[PDB]
Write a protein that binds this ligand. Structure first.
Ligand SMILES: CC(C)CNC(=O)[C@@H](NC[C@@H](O)[C@H](Cc1ccccc1)NC(=O)c1cc(C(=O)N[C@H](C)c2ccccc2)cc(N(C)S(C)(=O)=O)c1)[C@H](C)O
Length: 372
């Protein structure tokens, strides 16, 4: 069942995790970026400098035009295209074929990435944020109503120059994580929004108003590279990581992601970089759990060893991107309106520290952490 889906994700470092899919009749094989931070299924349908191949509706026996246009803007990049429907299949997924909506991308800007090796995007979030509007069915909703595939999927993103991982569609593969799964409620169903109730850095409470962490939302977004934080939080955090690593000095544009930093290979001072603990709302009253991330997650690798600072500011709330998701087995349990976290089988090691998921913790007034 699920062993066929283990390792069905590929990618280049810093360029995104994709899965193999086929569209149309006869089947057109395509690499599709897996994005929990959006809800449209789209593929390049026109020649592009960065695209090795693209979707051809002309050669599809099954393609149906919807004669509606569509435009989709992300934080990074944008595109427009022609809405249609076609048969879609997942080679290393469940043994099924569904008719799903597909946006055929004819125009785009700063969206496709050179060398990334993917030609499309699979938005796995809810209809509420689908473009043009919620009447356009997202892929996973189509898959669930048309088949007996359970309303659940898991993502295990394995970090660094080739990355890989697993998208378990329809279930939970217990050989891919250690310890117990801890679950946080999905607050409402648009993005996969969660509520962060406490933040620690090297075991010291950031001591911020709970609400600041979730202003105006906090989402789990596999389509985003970084851990993005609200301005006030981000400044609090950076001040703390600086002070921890003040033993060395970096140009200020490093903390902005504008510049790299290098160390002679094998001498990277991981110790002076702190661990970050995010506390998430739990399932029972006054109960939370924490996930802890190593500097090996937010110092992304680019003779020597060079790194980019992968914590950034945001004006759309906290975005728990690949930085957080790598090294965790993440269960998007839509059926039970919850997201599970567990230490990944491909958690990446520190000599004297480890990524963790721990509970139970007690946290009072967790509902006050939510922003309205
Ligand atoms: C459709 C609507 C619901 C709009 N939704 C959204 O805007 C929300 N989520 C965004 C994602 O949907 C989209 C989908 C996408 C876009 C472009 C290329 C590939 C994939 N992603 C991004 O905007 C995005 C991408 C990157 C980035 O570089 N990604 C590469 C592919 C990657 C590398 C490694 C791991 C994962 C992804 C960065 C960023 N950053 C801003 S950063 C430098 O990490 O701080 C943002 C947003 C966070 O609020």
């Amino acid at each position: 069942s699920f062993v066929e889906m283990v390792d069905n994700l590929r990618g280049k470092s810093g360029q995104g995790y994709y899965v193999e899919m086929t569209v149309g009749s006869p089947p057109q094989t395509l690499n599709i970026l897996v994005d929990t931070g959006s809800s449209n299924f789209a593929v390049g349908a026109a020649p592009h400098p960065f695209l090795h191949r693209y979707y051809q509706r002309q050669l599809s026996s099954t393609y149906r035009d919807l004669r509606k246009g569509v435009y989709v803007p992300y934080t990074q990049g944008k595109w427009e295209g022609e809405l249609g429907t076609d048969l879609v299949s997942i080679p290393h997924g469940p043994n099924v074929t569904v008719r799903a909506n597909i946006a055929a991308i004819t125009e785009s800007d700063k969206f496709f990435i050179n060398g990334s090796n993917w030609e499309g995007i699979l938005g796995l979030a809810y209809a509420e944020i689908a473009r043009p509007d919620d009447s356009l069915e997202p892929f996973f909703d189509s898959l669930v109503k048309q088949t007996h595939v359970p309303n659940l999927f898991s993502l295990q993103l394995c970090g660094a120059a080739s990355v890989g991982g697993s998208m378990i569609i329809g279930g939970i593969d217990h050989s891919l994580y250690t310890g117990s799964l801890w679950y946080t409620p999905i607050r409402r169903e648009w993005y996969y929004e969660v509520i962060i109730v406490r933040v620690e850095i090297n075991g010291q409470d950031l001591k911020m108003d709970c609400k600041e962490y979730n202003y105006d939302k906090s989402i789990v977004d596999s389509g985003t590279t970084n851990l993005r934080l609200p301005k006030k939080v981000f400044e609090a955090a950076v001040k703390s990581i600086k002070a921890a690593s003040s033993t060395e000095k970096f140009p200020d544009g490093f903390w902005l992601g504008e510049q790299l930093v290098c160390w002679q290979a094998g001498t990277t001072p991981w110790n002076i970089f702190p661990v970050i603990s995010l506390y998430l709302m739990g399932e029972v009253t006054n109960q939370s759990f924490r996930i802890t991330i190593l500097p090996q997650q937010y110092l992304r690798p680019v003779q020597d060893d060079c790194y980019k600072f992968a914590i950034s500011q945001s004006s759309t709330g906290t975005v728990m991107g690949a930085v957080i998701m790598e090294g965790f087995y993440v269960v998007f349990d839509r059926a039970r309106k919850r997201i599970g976290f567990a230490v990944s089988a491909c958690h990446v090691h520190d000599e004297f520290r480890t990524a963790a998921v721990e509970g139970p913790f007690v946290t009072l007034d967790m509902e006050d952490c939510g922003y309205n």
